[PDB]
Design a protein around this motif. Structure first.
Motif, mmCIF file in Angstrom:
data_model
loop_
_atom_site.group_PDB
_atom_site.id
_atom_site.type_symbol
_atom_site.label_atom_id
_atom_site.label_comp_id
_atom_site.label_asym_id
_atom_site.label_seq_id
_atom_site.Cartn_x
_atom_site.Cartn_y
_atom_site.Cartn_z
ATOM 1 N N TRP A 1 -9.479 6.633 12.821
ATOM 2 C CA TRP A 1 -8.305 6.733 13.666
ATOM 3 C C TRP A 1 -7.688 8.113 13.583
ATOM 4 C CZ3 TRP A 1 -8.835 2.942 16.676
ATOM 5 C CH2 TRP A 1 -9.195 1.676 16.218
ATOM 6 N N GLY A 2 -8.342 9.049 12.911
ATOM 7 C CA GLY A 2 -7.773 10.368 12.766
ATOM 8 C C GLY A 2 -6.588 10.421 11.841
ATOM 9 N N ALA A 3 -6.555 9.571 10.828
ATOM 10 C CA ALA A 3 -5.429 9.565 9.907
ATOM 11 C C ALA A 3 -5.563 10.743 8.960
ATOM 12 C CB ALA A 3 -5.374 8.256 9.131
ATOM 13 N N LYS B 1 -5.914 6.515 -2.175
ATOM 14 C CA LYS B 1 -5.840 5.087 -1.937
ATOM 15 C C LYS B 1 -4.462 4.696 -1.445
ATOM 16 C CE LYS B 1 -9.977 4.551 -3.183
ATOM 17 N NZ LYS B 1 -10.984 4.212 -2.148
ATOM 18 N N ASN B 2 -4.424 3.660 -0.618
ATOM 19 C CA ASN B 2 -3.163 3.161 -0.111
ATOM 20 C C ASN B 2 -2.427 2.397 -1.201
ATOM 21 O OD1 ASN B 2 -4.003 4.160 2.390
ATOM 22 N ND2 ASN B 2 -4.937 2.202 2.941
ATOM 23 N N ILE B 3 -1.170 2.075 -0.920
ATOM 24 C CA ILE B 3 -0.315 1.332 -1.833
ATOM 25 C C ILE B 3 0.189 0.109 -1.097
ATOM 26 C CG2 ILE B 3 1.675 1.392 -3.301
ATOM 27 C CD1 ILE B 3 1.482 4.389 -3.293
ATOM 28 N N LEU C 1 -3.103 7.024 18.491
ATOM 29 C CA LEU C 1 -1.903 6.294 18.883
ATOM 30 C C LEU C 1 -1.610 5.145 17.938
ATOM 31 C CD1 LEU C 1 0.241 5.963 21.196
ATOM 32 C CD2 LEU C 1 -1.030 3.881 21.635
ATOM 33 N N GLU C 2 -2.579 4.276 17.732
ATOM 34 C CA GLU C 2 -2.304 3.054 16.999
ATOM 35 C C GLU C 2 -2.285 3.227 15.492
ATOM 36 O OE1 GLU C 2 -6.372 0.984 17.916
ATOM 37 O OE2 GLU C 2 -6.040 1.653 15.846
ATOM 38 N N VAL C 3 -2.117 4.431 14.956
ATOM 39 C CA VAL C 3 -1.851 4.564 13.532
ATOM 40 C C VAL C 3 -0.535 5.282 13.242
ATOM 41 C CG1 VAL C 3 -2.859 6.752 12.786
ATOM 42 C CG2 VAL C 3 -3.180 4.711 11.417
ATOM 43 N N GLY D 1 -4.705 2.877 8.803
ATOM 44 C CA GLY D 1 -6.047 3.002 8.264
ATOM 45 C C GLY D 1 -6.908 1.816 8.630
ATOM 46 N N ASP D 2 -7.531 1.233 7.617
ATOM 47 C CA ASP D 2 -8.457 0.141 7.828
ATOM 48 C C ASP D 2 -7.717 -1.121 8.236
ATOM 49 O OD1 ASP D 2 -10.551 -1.932 7.447
ATOM 50 O OD2 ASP D 2 -11.620 -0.328 6.399
ATOM 51 N N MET D 3 -8.471 -2.047 8.822
ATOM 52 C CA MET D 3 -7.985 -3.403 8.992
ATOM 53 C C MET D 3 -8.221 -4.254 7.755
ATOM 54 S SD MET D 3 -6.396 -4.148 11.760
ATOM 55 C CE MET D 3 -6.586 -5.895 11.426
ATOM 56 N N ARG D 4 -8.995 -3.760 6.786
ATOM 57 C CA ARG D 4 -9.356 -4.584 5.641
ATOM 58 C C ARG D 4 -8.188 -4.853 4.714
ATOM 59 N NH1 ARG D 4 -14.597 -1.182 6.092
ATOM 60 N NH2 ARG D 4 -15.857 -2.715 7.235
#
Ligand SMILES: *[C@@H]1O[C@H](CO)[C@@H](O[C@@H]2O[C@H](CO)[C@@H](O[C@@H]3O[C@H](CO[C@H]4O[C@H](CO)[C@@H](O)[C@H](O)[C@@H]4O)[C@@H](O)[C@H](O[C@H]4O[C@H](CO)[C@@H](O)[C@H](O)[C@@H]4O)[C@@H]3O)[C@H](O)[C@H]2NC(C)=O)[C@H](O)[C@H]1NC(C)=O
Ligand SMILES: *[C@@H]1O[C@H](CO)[C@@H](O[C@@H]2O[C@H](CO)[C@@H](O[C@@H]3O[C@H](CO[C@H]4O[C@H](CO)[C@@H](O)[C@H](O)[C@@H]4O)[C@@H](O)[C@H](O[C@H]4O[C@H](CO)[C@@H](O)[C@H](O)[C@@H]4O)[C@@H]3O)[C@H](O)[C@H]2NC(C)=O)[C@H](O)[C@H]1NC(C)=O
Ligand SMILES: *[C@@H]1O[C@H](CO)[C@@H](O[C@@H]2O[C@H](CO)[C@@H](O[C@@H]3O[C@H](CO)[C@@H](O)[C@H](O[C@H]4O[C@H](CO)[C@@H](O)[C@H](O)[C@@H]4O)[C@@H]3O)[C@H](O)[C@H]2NC(C)=O)[C@H](O)[C@H]1NC(C)=O
Ligand SMILES: *[C@@H]1O[C@H](CO)[C@@H](O[C@@H]2O[C@H](CO)[C@@H](O[C@@H]3O[C@H](CO)[C@@H](O)[C@H](O[C@H]4O[C@H](CO)[C@@H](O)[C@H](O)[C@@H]4O)[C@@H]3O)[C@H](O)[C@H]2NC(C)=O)[C@H](O)[C@H]1NC(C)=O
Ligand SMILES: *[C@@H]1O[C@H](CO)[C@@H](O[C@@H]2O[C@H](CO)[C@@H](O[C@@H]3O[C@H](CO)[C@@H](O)[C@H](O[C@H]4O[C@H](CO)[C@@H](O)[C@H](O)[C@@H]4O)[C@@H]3O)[C@H](O)[C@H]2NC(C)=O)[C@H](O)[C@H]1NC(C)=O
Ligand SMILES: *[C@@H]1O[C@H](CO)[C@@H](O[C@@H]2O[C@H](CO)[C@@H](O[C@@H]3O[C@H](CO)[C@@H](O)[C@H](O)[C@@H]3O)[C@H](O)[C@H]2NC(C)=O)[C@H](O)[C@H]1NC(C)=O
Ligand SMILES: *[C@@H]1O[C@H](CO)[C@@H](O[C@@H]2O[C@H](CO)[C@@H](O[C@@H]3O[C@H](CO)[C@@H](O)[C@H](O)[C@@H]3O)[C@H](O)[C@H]2NC(C)=O)[C@H](O)[C@H]1NC(C)=O
Ligand SMILES: *[C@@H]1O[C@H](CO)[C@@H](O[C@@H]2O[C@H](CO)[C@@H](O[C@@H]3O[C@H](CO)[C@@H](O)[C@H](O)[C@@H]3O)[C@H](O)[C@H]2NC(C)=O)[C@H](O)[C@H]1NC(C)=O
Ligand SMILES: *[C@@H]1O[C@H](CO)[C@@H](O[C@@H]2O[C@H](CO)[C@@H](O[C@@H]3O[C@H](CO)[C@@H](O)[C@H](O)[C@@H]3O)[C@H](O)[C@H]2NC(C)=O)[C@H](O)[C@H]1NC(C)=O
Ligand SMILES: *[C@@H]1O[C@H](CO)[C@@H](O[C@@H]2O[C@H](CO)[C@@H](O[C@@H]3O[C@H](CO)[C@@H](O)[C@H](O)[C@@H]3O)[C@H](O)[C@H]2NC(C)=O)[C@H](O)[C@H]1NC(C)=O
Ligand SMILES: *[C@@H]1O[C@H](CO)[C@@H](O[C@@H]2O[C@H](CO)[C@@H](O)[C@H](O)[C@H]2NC(C)=O)[C@H](O)[C@H]1NC(C)=O
Ligand SMILES: *[C@@H]1O[C@H](CO)[C@@H](O[C@@H]2O[C@H](CO)[C@@H](O)[C@H](O)[C@H]2NC(C)=O)[C@H](O)[C@H]1NC(C)=O
Ligand SMILES: *[C@@H]1O[C@H](CO)[C@@H](O[C@@H]2O[C@H](CO)[C@@H](O)[C@H](O)[C@H]2NC(C)=O)[C@H](O)[C@H]1NC(C)=O
Ligand SMILES: *[C@@H]1O[C@H](CO)[C@@H](O[C@@H]2O[C@H](CO)[C@@H](O)[C@H](O)[C@H]2NC(C)=O)[C@H](O)[C@H]1NC(C)=O
Ligand SMILES: *[C@@H]1O[C@H](CO)[C@@H](O)[C@H](O)[C@H]1NC(C)=O
Ligand SMILES: *[C@@H]1O[C@H](CO)[C@@H](O)[C@H](O)[C@H]1NC(C)=O
Ligand SMILES: *[C@@H]1O[C@H](CO)[C@@H](O)[C@H](O)[C@H]1NC(C)=O
Ligand SMILES: *[C@@H]1O[C@H](CO)[C@@H](O)[C@H](O)[C@H]1NC(C)=O
Lengths: 102, 129, 453, 132, 132, 53, 53
Positions: B55-57, C243-245, C329-331, C421-424
């Motif tokens: 997504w280009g993050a 890594k995300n939180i 857009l969607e992030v 980011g991910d949908m996971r």
């Protein structure tokens, strides 16, 4: 911020021997990474996860250490092994070391 | 095999803008991060930023914020779904930016983390005067 | 005496760790909405009520949410169910055509731009010889300029085809239950404080999980399961900033979102037995679709998460927030699917604060895309039909997804930003309490007995 | 008679406790083992994997002395070089989960010992009923 | 002790040799029998055909005297009109492949004889424990 | 045995419609030669002598 | 002077994808549980009859 300290560094030796460079972290608990850069070329990965070797790596490069203190030890020095070396925990970096022919 | 290609060298006036392409080929581009890093003489390495192209993050370093931008372009056809293009863009140029820039990709093993970058580009030297 | 003899025992209760397939099953109320209008009743045995949830004493196992499996096959299965729910519906091939467009009738200020464009074009009738002239409405995020006059085309008609969803099949989630086949079990950590890694001292086994509702959302995950008492943050390697939180907080905070424009659908025919749904007239004033949350509850919950976050980074630390840095857009915004229509709603009004060491309502504006492309597949674009009437929806904000900035060079503040980011990670917010283990019978142990001839 | 006694637990219910108490119930751990449009293929391969595993276990038990006894004894003496544990402590101290990591090295040999022992016992009793 | 002895062969390894030597190993010939997008249907019907055959054989062995003995004897005397061979020659002369063409005519009757014999023995011992 | 086609060829992508590619054969850079195969003489004659024998 | 394709009067026509390659790869055949595959290792065996090894 985690700052790495490099030890001895400027190190002049003859072929056929063994050598060892030292690094020390300001925060323990994490892993370690070792990088080789030769003259006028692209750097290359030697050691990730403090003991594991990459592709195209002879096992005479051995990394070790624990906590904050890590050693990089090369036995049986060759002519191509004279290069500049870097330690790496995270986005931070250390200053480097110098291997020279004596 | 994994391959990266950078752009040609460049000299720029101070207070200019520079856009650097990094073209990737040999693997599925939608699955791996891309990092940008710099190398100055008498400075060692200094990390800039990282971008995921699904997504280009992006994320940039703190001491370089407001002066950089990373975009991507994927490949959209069912013929060659692997190649991809990353674009770095740098504004507000100072004479201290005399350096060489690199785009990297990490290793692809199990205990491979994210920062042990395996594959590298051939480096672009940038001179500001 | 001292000649102890071996003895084999069948059915010793002991297990190991393994990986296998799983089993999808839901309730009996989902079969009342008949003829597979909801998905996950093509492939669903009805769940049996009151399954066993047996408790255990002393036994203590370690869990790990980050290398956990079965989330990967969940991310596979939802994509496969999505693709199976589309092939019986119509294609939209003859719609890629030259569009004659203009502005809708509205007293427009010159500096503001129209969110709706009004287009007319040609289309084949039921026969092959007649062709007709018809008109419809579109959003600006779906047409682009082809290049006196002024004409547009659709955004997707240069790389892909386009499939319309059927208006029969609904989009709301339903509680999916997962179950293990014969010869395995699912463990569950019932400990009150367990961050996400390591040993858990009070376990319980199970045959089927609780209710799981799959919702797709990018930031600020919705309709989730809140924790018991405190506000828990979890991460894999905290000092790593890649890594995300995941933040799960205790009390849910209400959120409203609505689109106020009254809409009229319209049925164009493409040919033999092909329907197509345009967007006809608009009865009412053109307003802008938006979302409301309460002020003080949001500020108090942010105070809660600051108070809990301070333990992982030392007490004397300035902590602040900022909006999303950039990207597609969607992030940047956060995005969801309410009432059978997709919203993308800006979130910059919530993440602007700084926090020292010691009745009114917030609105935020959204946008509406008609065509979508989730999972970013290379040849798969999906159209969505419009609906009737004013739309509003209420929900519970439950969790948060954050990302630290990689700040070097000696700065005491640690900013945080939302990143989808991910949908996971949305499923990893709900499968943080189950590993799957495999039974092994026939142990063997020495004792003092001996078989006679 | 019984005001409050330990009734029974679910399958793997006793598995935290010691082996002496856990050996009282095996049938519960044994019964919950058999039973209780592309997806049908996944369910069918799951079911046949289950019955394949159970049939392998039944055959491997059949080639030793005991087909369907569910508790056996045999004629192979315990070598103490494997376990080095007292008899008094194992039945009143440890669990099977605790046990399996201790006996994990010495496997796949004991099975062959049981095979050879049952084979020799069968041929000798065959010779016995041959002269009978 | 053993410098060079015959260790063991693969399954069907002994099958060229005589029956007396081949009867020493049966477990090898027994173990290699169970286990070791349209194509999944072919694999699944192959696997269920395998377990169907093995279960038929287990049931047919179960209805005689021996369920899981793997070597049995019974109470039906050998009629020499089938085989007309000496005892001394068969165990030291012929193979099973050689044997099967010789005994191919007299099959499907011996099975029924075993059925009736086991049935009558079961009802008589039933009467014995009935008066017990 | 060797076989080869020597003519250099350039492919070209025509679009049929939405998301349909089609590959033509564009320009030809070089002389138009003829694709052919080579085998060795004596080995072929000796193997034919073998199969006659 | 005008032409047409050879196949457009009896059939449709399907283009192969340029992703999928055409070179062979070593396919191994295997028997399921409960069978075996025999193999004659004799040096001279023309193709019919008994093989002693
Ligand atoms: C988190 O979870 C909450 C709680 O469920 C969700 O909020 C609900 O979302 C659903 C959407 O599926 C809403 O359901 C809709 O309600 C409409 C109003 O129903 C009222 O009116 C009818 C008729 O008078 C009464 O019978 C009923 O009792 C209600 O009082 C319905 O009109 C909708 O149905 C429409 O679609 C179907 C599809 O074919 C048609 O058949 C119908 O005829 C009709 O056209 C639908 O039922 C519900 O109102 C929401 N609120 C509550 C409190 O449940 C959130 O959506 C969820 N979070 C997210 C992000 O989705
Ligand atoms: C998510 O939500 C946030 C919160 O609303 C949005 O943030 C705002 O975004 C706007 C971008 O449009 C920010 O910028 C403002 O835009 C105005 C538009 O300029 C018009 O007017 C000028 C003349 O004033 C014309 O020349 C021009 O052509 C436009 O027609 C600016 O005028 C604003 O300037 C204001 O501040 C400066 C400095 O004080 C003054 O000099 C001006 O007179 C005026 O008062 C302004 O720059 C706006 O600032 C953002 N809000 C906040 C609080 O900062 C995000 O945009 C939204 N996300 C997305 C993707 O849209
Ligand atoms: C921070 O990030 C790290 C990753 O960067 C993350 O992972 C943990 O790293 C440690 C390494 O310190 C892992 O521990 C290893 O686990 C494996 C599992 O088998 C062992 O083989 C390892 O053995 C070591 O010692 C052996 C002796 O010869 C060596 O041969 C071997 O190569 C190793 O050196 C070692 O125990 C650990 O498994 C991971 N993962 C976890 C969940 O801990 C770490 O979790 C992050 N967080 C923290 C707080 O560090
Ligand atoms: C999102 O939209 C929903 C729309 O339903 C909205 O939920 C409703 O909010 C109103 C007001 O916030 C709630 O009304 C309340 O009713 C209870 C019980 O009747 C009363 O205690 C409250 O006030 C009453 O008493 C007051 C005197 O103390 C009077 O002055 C007043 O007029 C009332 O008589 C209060 O009004 C209503 O219950 C909810 N409904 C639901 C289903 O939630 C929600 O508030 C919106 N979200 C936000 C953040 O605003
Ligand atoms: C089909 O095309 C292939 C194209 O690769 C071709 O195979 C090559 O053929 C050449 C010549 O027939 C081979 O080159 C040989 O190299 C070996 C080892 O280097 C030498 O012994 C040979 O001659 C050398 O020494 C001579 C003096 O004795 C010198 O005069 C001479 O210049 C050489 O130095 C010989 O040249 C080559 O090895 C092959 N390569 C492969 C991969 O097979 C093939 O011959 C063509 N088919 C036919 C039927 O022609
Ligand atoms: C854009 O949308 C507008 C409305 O939002 C559409 O305009 C409408 O088009 C119809 C065409 O049949 C017009 O109807 C005609 O109106 C006159 C008025 O008296 C009547 O005499 C005729 O017999 C016929 O009924 C209608 O007036 C017009 N709306 C307005 C406000 O003028 C239009 O189709 C859309 N597309 C464009 C402009 O390309
Ligand atoms: C939808 O279909 C209609 C009807 O087929 C199309 O109308 C046609 O439009 C073209 C170009 O706009 C016209 O050509 C023009 O003709 C006039 C005089 O004939 C000439 O002055 C122009 O230079 C140009 O050649 C054509 O005549 C016209 N036909 C009819 C019957 O009106 C229309 O373009 C189609 N598309 C849309 C988006 O409306
Ligand atoms: C989440 O929960 C896990 C499990 O409790 C935590 O991991 C554990 O963290 C502690 C530090 O608080 C580790 O202790 C360290 O052990 C090494 C071992 O040599 C020692 O040298 C250090 O001085 C320190 O005491 C512990 O090993 C580690 N793992 C386990 C299995 O307990 C984790 O910290 C918790 N929190 C977060 C935010 O992840
Ligand atoms: C996150 O926050 C920053 C700061 O509030 C936002 O930056 C703002 O971005 C908008 C649009 O990208 C800028 O608006 C500008 O308006 C003029 C009007 O003509 C236009 O010419 C420009 O091209 C641009 O659209 C605005 O100046 C800028 N604010 C600042 C202080 O630089 C950012 O958009 C926020 N992110 C999201 C997703 O909302
Ligand atoms: C390929 O191998 C097979 C097997 O060795 C050959 O078939 C055999 O050919 C011989 C002739 O050389 C046959 O012998 C003949 O037997 C009849 C029996 O009455 C006898 O009357 C003749 O005078 C002659 O001796 C033999 O039966 C036949 N089959 C077998 C099982 O051995 C075959 O000739 C070989 N060559 C070719 C080119 O097919
Ligand atoms: C439809 O709306 C657009 C958007 O406002 C109008 O475009 C304007 O055109 C004039 C003259 O070309 C410019 O001066 C304005 O600056 C434009 N607006 C913008 C936001 O760029 C267009 O004219 C409108 N068309 C009709 C028929 O109303
Ligand atoms: C949205 O628009 C529809 C269509 O006009 C409105 O439905 C009308 O409601 C009035 C009042 O009962 C009726 O007289 C009309 O017959 C209705 N029309 C149709 C087609 O059903 C609806 O009320 C509007 N929504 C509002 C105003 O909230
Ligand atoms: C959203 O939050 C509300 C409360 O903020 C939840 O409502 C409760 O639901 C439970 C279970 O149905 C009831 O027993 C309570 O009476 C409800 N009210 C309160 C005040 O607790 C609601 O379940 C949450 N989820 C959804 C989907 O709405
Ligand atoms: C076949 O044709 C291609 C296309 O011209 C040739 O590729 C060119 O090679 C030269 C020499 O390096 C380059 O300067 C051109 O840029 C190349 N063009 C392309 C499109 O890659 C190729 O060399 C030819 N094959 C031969 C001569 O054997
Ligand atoms: C399709 O059109 C968009 C419009 O901007 C363009 O960005 C994209 O590159 C186009 N793709 C192709 C394959 O032409
Ligand atoms: C949140 O509430 C507290 C107490 O009411 C207040 O001191 C604080 O300023 C509020 N937060 C913000 C960002 O204003
Ligand atoms: C920063 O925070 C406050 C409240 O949200 C306000 O001053 C301002 O609107 C915020 N910044 C932006 C860009 O919205
Ligand atoms: C198609 O065309 C070929 C061209 O010669 C001809 O031989 C063949 O008969 C034709 N088939 C039909 C069905 O027309």
């Amino acid at each position: 911020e985690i700052v790495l300290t490099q030890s001895p560094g400027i190190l002049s030796l003859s072929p056929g021997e063994t050598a060892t460079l030292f690094c020390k972290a300001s925060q323990g608990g994490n892993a370690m990474t070792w990088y080789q850069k030769r003259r006028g070329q692209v750097p290359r990965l030697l050691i990730y996860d403090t003991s594991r070797r990459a592709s195209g790596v002879p096992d005479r490069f051995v990394g070790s250490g624990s906590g904050t203190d890590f050693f990089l030890t090369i036995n049986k020095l060759d002519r191509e092994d004279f290069a500049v070396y870097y330690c790496q925990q995270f986005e931070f970096f250390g200053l480097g070391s110098e291997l020279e022919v004596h | 095999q994994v391959q990266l290609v950078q752009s040609g060298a460049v000299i720029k006036t101070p207070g200019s803008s520079v856009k650097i392409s990094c073209r990737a080929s040999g693997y599925n581009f939608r699955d791996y991060s891309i990092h940008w890093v710099r190398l100055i003489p008498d400075k060692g390495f200094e990390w800039i930023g990282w971008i995921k192209p699904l997504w280009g993050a992006v994320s940039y370093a703190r001491q370089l914020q407001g002066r950089v931008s990373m975009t991507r372009q994927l490949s959209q056809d069912p013929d060659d779904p692997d190649w991809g293009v990353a674009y770095m863009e740098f504004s507000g140029l100072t004479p201290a930016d005399t350096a060489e820039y690199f785009c990297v990709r990490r290793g692809s093993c199990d205990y491979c983390g994210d920062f042990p970058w395996q594959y590298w580009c051939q480096g672009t030297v940038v001179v500001v005067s | 005496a001292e000649n102890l003899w071996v003895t084999v025992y069948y059915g010793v209760p002991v297990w190991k760790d393994a990986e296998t397939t799983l089993f999808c099953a839901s309730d009996a109320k989902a079969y009342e909405t008949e003829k597979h209008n909801v998905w996950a009743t093509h492939a669903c045995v009805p769940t049996d009520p009151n399954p066993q949830e047996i408790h255990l004493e002393n036994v203590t196992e370690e869990f790990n949410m980050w290398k956990n499996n079965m989330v990967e096959q969940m991310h596979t299965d939802i994509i496969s169910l999505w693709d199976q729910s589309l092939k019986p519906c119509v294609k939209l091939t003859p719609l890629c055509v030259t569009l004659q467009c203009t502005n809708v009738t509205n007293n427009i200020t010159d500096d503001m731009r129209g969110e709706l464009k009004n287009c007319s074009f040609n289309m084949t009738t039921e026969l092959r010889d007649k062709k007709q002239k018809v008109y419809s409405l579109f959003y600006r995020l779906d047409v682009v300029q082809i290049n006196s006059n002024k004409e547009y085309r659709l955004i997707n008609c240069n790389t892909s085809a386009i499939t319309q969803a059927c208006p029969k099949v609904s989009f709301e989630p339903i509680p999916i239950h997962y179950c293990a086949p014969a010869g395995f079990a699912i463990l569950k950590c019932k400990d009150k404080k367990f961050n996400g890694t390591g040993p858990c001292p009070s376990v319980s086994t199970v045959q089927c999980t609780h209710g799981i509702k799959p919702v797709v959302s990018t930031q600020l995950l919705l309709n989730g399961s809140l924790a018991e008492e405190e506000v828990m943050i979890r991460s894999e390697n905290i000092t790593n900033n890649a890594k995300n939180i995941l933040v799960q907080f205790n009390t849910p905070v209400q959120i409203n979102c609505t689109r106020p424009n009254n809409n009229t659908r319209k049925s164009i025919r493409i040919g033999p037995g092909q329907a197509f749904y345009a967007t006809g007239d608009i009865i009412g004033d053109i307003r802008q679709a938006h979302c409301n949350v309460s002020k003080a509850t949001w500020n108090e919950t942010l105070g809660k998460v600051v108070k809990q976050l301070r333990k992982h980074f030392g007490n004397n630390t300035i902590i602040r927030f900022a909006n999303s840095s950039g990207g597609d857009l969607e992030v940047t915004t956060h995005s969801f699917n309410c009432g059978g229509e997709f919203f993308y709603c800006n979130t910059s009004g919530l993440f602007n604060s700084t926090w020292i060491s010691n009745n009114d309502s917030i609105t935020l504006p959204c946008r509406i895309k008609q065509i979508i492309n989730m999972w970013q597949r290379i040849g798969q674009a999906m159209y969505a039909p419009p609906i009737q009437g004013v739309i509003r929806c209420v929900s519970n904000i439950t969790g948060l997804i954050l990302t630290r900035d990689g700040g070097s060079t000696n700065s005491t503040t640690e900013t945080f930003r939302p990143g989808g980011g991910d949908m996971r990670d949305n499923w990893r917010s709900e499968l943080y309490k189950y590993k799957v283990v495999k039974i092994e019978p026939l142990g063997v142990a020495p004792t003092r007995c001996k078989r006679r001839v | 008679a019984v005001g409050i006694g330990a009734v029974f637990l679910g399958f793997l219910g006793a598995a935290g406790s010691t082996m002496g108490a856990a050996s009282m119930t095996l049938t519960v751990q044994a019964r919950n083992l058999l039973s209780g449009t592309v997806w049908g293929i996944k369910q069918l391969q799951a079911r046949v994997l289950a019955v394949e595993r159970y049939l392998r276990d039944q055959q491997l038990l059949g080639i030793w002395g005991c087909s369907g006894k569910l508790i056996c004894c045999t004629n192979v003496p315990w070598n103490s070089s494997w376990s080095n544990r007292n008899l008094s402590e194992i039945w009143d101290n440890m669990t099977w989960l605790q046990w399996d990591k201790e006996i994990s090295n010495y496997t796949q040999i004991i099975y062959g010992l049981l095979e050879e022992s049952q084979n020799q016992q069968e041929k000798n009793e065959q010779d016995l009923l041959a002269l009978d």
